[PDB]
Amino acid sequence: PELFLQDLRSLVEAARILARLARQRGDEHALERAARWAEQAARQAERLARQARKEGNLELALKALQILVNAAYVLAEIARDRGNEELLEYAARLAEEAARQAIEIAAQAMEEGNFELALEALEIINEAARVLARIAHHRGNQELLEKAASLTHASAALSRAIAAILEGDVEKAVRAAQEAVKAAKEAGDNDMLRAVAIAALRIAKEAEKQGNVEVAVKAARVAVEAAKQAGDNDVLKRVSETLLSIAAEATKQGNSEVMEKAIRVSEEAEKQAG
Amino acid sequence: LELALKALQILVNAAYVLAEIARDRGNEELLEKAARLAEEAARQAERIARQARKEGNLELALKALQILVNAAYVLAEIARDRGNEELLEYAARLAEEAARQAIEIWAQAMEEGNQQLRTKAAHIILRAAEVLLEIARDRGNQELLEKAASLVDAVAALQQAAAAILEGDVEKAVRAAQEAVKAAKEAGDNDMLRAVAIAALRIAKEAEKQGNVEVAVKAARVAVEAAKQAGDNDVLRKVAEQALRIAKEAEKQGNVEVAVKAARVAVEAAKQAGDNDVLRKVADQALEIAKAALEQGDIDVAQKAMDVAVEALTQA
Amino acid sequence: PRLVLRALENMVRAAHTLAEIARDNGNEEWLERAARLAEEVARRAERLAREARKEGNLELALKALQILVNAAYVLAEIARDRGNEEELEYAARLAEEAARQAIEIAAQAMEEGNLELALKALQIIVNAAYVLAEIARDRGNEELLEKAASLAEAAAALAEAIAAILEGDVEKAVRAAQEAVKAAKEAGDNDMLRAVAIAALRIAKEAEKQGNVEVAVKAARVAVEAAKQAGDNDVLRKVAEQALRIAKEAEKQGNVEVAVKAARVAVEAAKQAGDNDVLRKVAEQALEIAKKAAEQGDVGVMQKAMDVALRAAGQA
């Protein structure tokens, strides 16, 4: 259905242009009609996005999320003039959900190490905040701006951390992860923290692949920090296991001190998993 | 032409910025030079745009349209700050001529089903209308803005209908088409009546497979409206064939009432056509429809069918 | 490769949003973090560009240049509202270095005849120049506006000339190039003029296929106009070789008048370089032109061929 997105986006543009002309003409009936044109696209696009999760083509899925982001922009562009908060509330709840569903896609992609899809999903996450923030500028709650900014701030650090792994510097990656976990602490979202922990696992796997088990201990120590702040037991299991993998590689290098540290942190991760 | 098109697509960006620099300086010599260059870019792009109508690569044609539609933005920006109504009118007339050309893509892509062209052409209409908006924005000429309004409203319905043809909800398709003809007729769509009209025939082809000839005839009632507003000429030859097909199916379905509505549409159209052989083919079937209505004992319907037969045959 | 560029680009998106959101509130730390990010991105991108120059993927290189332009926009957006000249000075230094790198990319692409990469690089120059123009107005430096304006105009004039090479109107291409060298010269950057000279070499190299030796000499007249500012001997030697090729074709065509004028441009360039091997080869061929003018019986053209060959000999 490759046309469907193109046509959906055409309806978003048509509603935007109708609303410009309607504002020259003072026409609330045109603003109603434009909102309806956009809403028809948005409702169908929500179903498409939720459905595509089953179908498993993540490229088409995140491309569908782009519809939601641009639609939400146009809806805000109307509603901020129209003086109706219910439409803003619908759009805000839809956008927050779209960001959350993007994070779910990102977590799946980063566990597989498909950094390409990860950057594409992170791109949706980076942009979705812009619309939420322009809404919040009119609604006045600075807390929403703080949330939106922090949401970008964490996904930006993840984007950087990917670049460091692709460049091959796991210590730069660990430094970027240390920035990422602070950004996540500012953001206060457990699902973003899951994305961080999944990335920190993938970073630890790279540091094991390089034999830099000391850096792997730092990566895992961030991973368990993120997981301990979030409360995800299945992450904490995967982390605790991985830390024994690190202890085994440290044993292969003969480093008994790093092995002991890897066991102690594996035990902390197990103690948190319960 | 890939390179030359890409260069034109680039060129506008500099022309724009150069106007911004010149306007920040108050350097009218640069503004004049930029205006002349922006015009020349359209005069170059027109070469490809008219040639492609011969050569048949519609993708290159819609790229040339994209070039023109984007390029017009610079003329508008210069001319509105300069207060030059002549250049604004030149840009608006260029955009109208481009719209005349854009229907070529839209209609042909819709008829052939090469819809990958249609999506781009629709967005091109949207951008063109937005260019009319930004030409008109401070000027307040609502008479021009009627073009932008009607086109974009029509696009919203046309785009929905184009999806509905793939989706098969003919009632959704008609719910859109009902508005589309209203706008088209209120505006005086000119050739854009064709872009409304072809959809109704394309719908009907599938609506026969779906068997809801009643909704297919609701679409045909629009098809003859657009034809009759237009003077769509030889397109009536397509219309009448499909109407005869619809009637033959309505006979297989025993829906002589819908068959008679289809014939009532068909004769309305054929009376504009004056294609005597088509009028003969219509009158030939109109007796058969009256005969079907006799076989049903629906003598009021047989009467209407033979009234149509006479109304057709009397043109011979 | 791909991932790193996408990540840098999307980090620029993030920085752009961070500054956009911060200006609605007055969050100074969000601006400070954004500025640090944009600087680190620029620093990493410079390394990336230098490495890409060794790797020879010109497309990855020019994409990194577009990333640098976008980052320079974010830096400028913070700095001009923050009200600080030093951050604008860093951005200007980055932008001019990027422009020099772009000129080198463009030189290679235009020498190789990859007009695709040439157009891309020129568009990068237009975008870079737009950031410089926005900086220059708000910083208060009209000469930096001249640099930005000339960079953008020249780059888009070369793109226009490239479109005219592809349409085949070499005279109109030369008309565009004449205005290009004038614009570049009005700011006076020898590095841009090196790119312009290499574009004139591209024009001449294509004109050898067409056989319009008269317009080819006019292209060489543009070439020397730039090359006489820039002074690089290898560029001048390439110009001299093209001028001798044009002269040899004018001998084969029997247009000894154009051949003498081709030599008149050849010596104009070769006199700037002072290379004895060139000047002896030039003077030798100029006597071959004099011999052909005598064999054609064109007495005055032979007197001129003598005069030019003699003046060429008079340099070595």
Best residue of C12, C13, C33, C60 to probe chain A, by most A CBs closer than 10 Å: C13
What's the start-to-end Cα distance of chain C, in Å?
51
Residues in chain A: 274
What's the start-to-end Cα distance of chain B, in Å?
52
Q: CA of B17, closest CA in chain C: separation in Å?
A: 7
**Which chains, if any, share at least 3 CB pairs under 8 A with chain B?**
A, C
Backbone angles phi, psi at C254, to 5 degrees: 75, 5
Residues in chain B: 316
Using CB atoms, which residue from A122, A137, A166 is nearest to C10?
A: A122
Give A-chain residues touching C40 at CB under 8 angstroms.
Answer: none
Q: Cα B301 from chain centroid?
A: 35
Q: Contact B25/B51 with Cβ under 8 angstroms?
A: no
Q: CA of C252, closest CA in chain B: separation in Å?
A: 32
Q: Contact B217/B181 with Cβ under 8 angstroms?
A: no
Closest CA to B158 of B207, B192, B108: B192
**Chain A residue with Cα closest to C5:** A163
Give exposure, A90-102, as e/b (b: 16+ Cβ within 10 Å): bbbebbbebbebb
- 8 Å CB contact of B3 and C133: no
Give B-chain residues touching A14 at CB under 8 angstroms.
Answer: 126, 152, 155-156, 159
Using CB atoms, which residue from C137, C156, C167 is nearest to B14?
A: C156
Measured CA to CA, the distance from residue C8 to residue C10 in angstroms comes to 5
CA dihedral sign of residues B63, B65, B66, B67: positive
Using CB atoms, which residue from B119, B148, B152 is nearest to A6?
A: B119
Measured CA to CA, the distance from residue A48 to residue A60 in angstroms comes to 10
Residue for token pair 């050739």: B191
Give B-chain residues touching C119 at CB under 8 angstroms.
Answer: 3, 6-7, 10
Neighbours of A182 (CB within 10 A): 13
Q: CA of A218, closest CA in chain C: separation in Å?
A: 23
Q: Contact A37/A14 with Cβ under 8 angstroms?
A: yes
- SS3 per-residue string spanning chain A: CHHHHHHHHHHHHHHHHHHHHHHHCCCHHHHHHHHHHHHHHHHHHHHHHHHHHHHCCHHHHHHHHHHHHHHHHHHHHHHHHHCCHHHHHHHHHHHHHHHHHHHHHHHHHHHHCCHHHHHHHHHHHHHHHHHHHHHHHHHCCHHHHHHHHHHHHHHHHHHHHHHHHHHCCHHHHHHHHHHHHHHHHHHCCHHHHHHHHHHHHHHHHHHHHCCCHHHHHHHHHHHHHHHHHHCCHHHHHHHHHHHHHHHHHHHHCCCHHHHHHHHHHHHHHHHHHC
Closest CA to A104 of A92, A119, A116, A121: A121
**Chain C residue with Cα closest to B40:** C160
What is the count of residue pairs from A and C with beta carbons less than 8 Å apart? 68
- SS3 per-residue string spanning chain B: CHHHHHHHHHHHHHHHHHHHHHHHHCCHHHHHHHHHHHHHHHHHHHHHHHHHHHHCCHHHHHHHHHHHHHHHHHHHHHHHHHCCHHHHHHHHHHHHHHHHHHHHHHHHHHHHCCHHHHHHHHHHHHHHHHHHHHHHCCCCCHHHHHHHHHHHHHHHHHHHHHHHHHHCCHHHHHHHHHHHHHHHHHHCCCCHHHHHHHHHHHHHHHHHHHCCHHHHHHHHHHHHHHHHHHCCCCHHHHHHHHHHHHHHHHHHCCCHHHHHHHHHHHHHHHHHHCCHHHHHHHHHHHHHHHHHHHHCCCHHHHHHHHHHHHHHHCCC
Closest CA to A110 of A167, A182, A161: A161
Residues of C with CB under 8 A from a CB of B: 115-116, 119, 122-123, 126-127, 129-130, 133, 137, 142, 145, 148-149, 152-153, 155-156, 159-160, 162-163, 166-167
Check residue C255 and report its DSSP letter: -
| Counts of helices then strands in chain C (DSSP H, E) | 13, 0
Which whole-number Å values give the CA distances from A64 to A71, B283, C19, in the listed order?
Answer: 11, 52, 27
Q: How was this structure determined?
A: cryo-EM
Q: What is the dihedral of CA B68, B72, B73, B77, to 10 degrees?
A: 160
Give C-chain residues touching A155 at CB under 8 angstroms.
Answer: 14
Measured CA to CA, the distance from residue A188 to residue A100 in angstroms comes to 13
Check residue C44 and report its DSSP letter: H
Using CB atoms, which residue from C4, C13, C21 is nearest to A127?
A: C13
Q: CA of C195, closest CA in chain B: separation in Å?
A: 17
Check residue C241 and report its DSSP letter: H
Q: Contact B94/B72 with Cβ under 8 angstroms?
A: yes
Burial class (CB in 10 A: 0-12, 13-18, 19+), A168: exposed
Closest CA to C94 of C51, C38, C134: C38
- 8 Å CB contact of C4 and A167: yes
Using CB atoms, which residue from A10, A25, A40 is nearest to B123?
A: A10
Measured CA to CA, the distance from residue C271 to residue C189 in angstroms comes to 22
CA dihedral sign of residues A155, A158, A160, A162: negative
Give B-chain residues touching A7 at CB under 8 angstroms.
Answer: 119, 122, 159, 162-163
Q: CA of B227, closest CA in chain A: separation in Å?
A: 26
- SS3 per-residue string spanning C275-289: CHHHHHHHHHHHHHH
- B residues 164-203 closer than 8 Å to A (CB): 166
**Chain A residue with Cα closest to B145:** A21
**Chain A residue with Cα closest to C13:** A126
- 8 Å CB contact of C130 and B17: yes
Residue C54 touches chain A, beta carbons under 8 Å: no
Which whole-number Å values give the CA distances from C82 to A134, C19, C30, C37, C76, in the listed order?
Answer: 21, 11, 12, 16, 9
CA dihedral sign of residues C34, C38, C40, C44: positive
**Chain B residue with Cα closest to C131:** B17
Burial class (CB in 10 A: 0-12, 13-18, 19+), B276: exposed
Contacts of C193 (CB under 8 A, 6+ apart): C181, C184, C185, C226, C227, C229, C230
Neighbours of A233 (CB within 10 A): 12
Measured CA to CA, the distance from residue B134 to residue B127 in angstroms comes to 10
Resolution in A: 4.3
Residue for token pair 């003919």: B170
Closest CA to C122 of C86, C156, C94: C156
Q: Cα A1 from chain centroid?
A: 26
Closest CA to C159 of C188, C131, C102, C120: C120
Measured CA to CA, the distance from residue C134 to residue B24 in angstroms comes to 10
Tokens found for residue C120: 């891309």
**Chain C residue with Cα closest to B45:** C163
User: Which residue type occupies C103?
Assistant: I
Measured CA to CA, the distance from residue A64 to residue A71 in angstroms comes to 11
Backbone angles phi, psi at B142, to 5 degrees: -60, -25
Q: Contact A240/A273 with Cβ under 8 angstroms?
A: yes
Measured CA to CA, the distance from residue B275 to residue B280 in angstroms comes to 9
Q: Contact A34/A19 with Cβ under 8 angstroms?
A: yes
Tokens found for residue A175: 């430094």
Q: What is the dihedral of CA A59, B118, C120, B13, to 10 degrees?
A: -120
Residue C84 touches chain A, beta carbons under 8 Å: no
Best residue of A66, A73, A152 to probe chain C, by most C CBs closer than 10 Å: A152
Give A-chain residues touching C8 at CB under 8 angstroms.
Answer: 163
Q: Contact B39/B32 with Cβ under 8 angstroms?
A: no
Which whole-number Å values give the CA distances from B222 to B160, B196, B206, C229, in the listed order?
Answer: 16, 9, 17, 70
Burial class (CB in 10 A: 0-12, 13-18, 19+), B234: exposed
Closest CA to B99 of B131, B76, B74, B75: B131
Q: Contact B12/C130 with Cβ under 8 angstroms?
A: no
**Chain B residue with Cα closest to C125:** B14
Give A-chain residues touching B133 at CB under 8 angstroms.
Answer: 17, 20-21
